[PDB]
């Protein structure tokens, strides 16, 4: 129980913010952060996120998960040769560029890329008319909104176990858009509404806080 | 009617793709991407996209819009203040990095900012204990899937116009997952379904291209 990013980023600057919990650790080369990092709670360790022996001293073994935001794409897969040569056993997630890469990156020991290059590139491309499409991205997720994306576990003898998604219907009764639902790591993207839900599910939505809470409350034993 | 991108990127090579309209011309310093550019039918121009003068070479005046795709977050200023000095009229699409600058970057005469930076970064920060909302993020956004936002035009006098959200019932005739309406650019995202639709309007929903045809069918006119 304890997370570790490995390379500096501007928005690292904001990963470390949410992410305050038991233990932050932060490997970079450049000695410049080490004031940012720390004046943030979190742990600072400098060295070479290739190096194995500097991995090691930033307690990669054990970890929580592992994230690596790095300026190459090679840099990265090093990196991640690096991270399970200690742990065949941690979370990966690693920022990508390239999207021939991707699936190199994932080889590598990857568990989760990202490519916000590929993103980006395609949000312009399509916002050339209206940014109609840039504008939602820019809200749940650039953070320009308080409307956001969630999971919601569902716990232990819900409420809303074994009963159908047509029945569900939660945006109707607390108004948060369900959009897929994840189950043992694969996620069913706008499921059917003749899908059960099983008691341990993640329900993948978007909205406001009350309209969280409230789906919080509706699927509470 | 006529595009114009500015710098090079992993994701030209994208943007350029879906990007095939009656013009795209490219501007960048780095002469190596002369060969891809034109091997995907657009204009290549070499000059540095902080220069008045090379914009013009550009045609970046009177363009359909303009796209900027810069390494440093102030170049992209400078490149805006040089745009509109050709262009009060102009659109401005920008990718950006810092969350600081956005604001600038917009005064700047920018209409679309992008900040893909902002969005890793808390995906990364909110996917430790599952990719889930990545994997979304990664499908409709990332491109893994087919599944993908929309937009869809309302038009002149269609069976919609006229028409509550509540009514409308696109998911459950259409199976598209509608998430926000756009008009006069102002996107409201998950509209009450006491809203009606105005001839004129556009949805922004999210699926596969089945439920968009079907959307595509449904509001017509």
């Known amino acids: 129980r304890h997370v570790v990013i490995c390379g500096w980023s501007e928005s690292t600057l904001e990963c470390l913010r949410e992410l305050r919990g038991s233990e932050v650790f932060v490997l970079a080369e450049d000695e410049n952060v080490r004031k940012k990092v720390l004046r943030s709670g979190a742990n600072f360790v400098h060295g070479d996120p290739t190096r194995v022996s500097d991995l090691e001293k930033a307690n990669v073994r054990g970890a929580r998960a592992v994230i690596v935001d790095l300026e190459s794409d090679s840099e990265t897969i090093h990196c991640i040769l690096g991270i399970r040569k200690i742990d065949?056993?941690?979370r990966i997630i690693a920022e990508a560029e390239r999207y021939e890469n991707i699936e190199q990156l994932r080889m590598a020991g990857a568990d989760q890329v990202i490519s916000p290059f590929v993103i980006s590139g395609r949000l312009m491309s399509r916002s050339i008319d209206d940014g109609y499409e840039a504008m939602f991205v820019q809200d749940v997720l650039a953070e320009?909104?308080?409307?956001?994306?969630?999971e919601v576990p569902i716990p232990e003898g819900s409420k809303l176990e074994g009963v159908s998604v047509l029945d569900a219907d939660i945006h109707d009764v607390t108004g948060v858009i369900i959009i897929g639902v994840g189950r043992g790591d694969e996620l069913i993207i706008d499921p059917p509404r003749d899908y059960s839900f099983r008691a341990g599910?993640?329900?993948?939505?978007?909205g406001k806080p009350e309209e969280i809470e409230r789906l919080k409350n509706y699927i509470s034993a």
């Not at 599910?201 to 978007?206: K, N, S, V």
């Open 144 to 150: 320009e909104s308080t409307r956001r994306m969630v």
């Open 201 to 206: 599910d993640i329900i993948l939505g978007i």
């Open 88 to 90: 065949e056993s941690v």
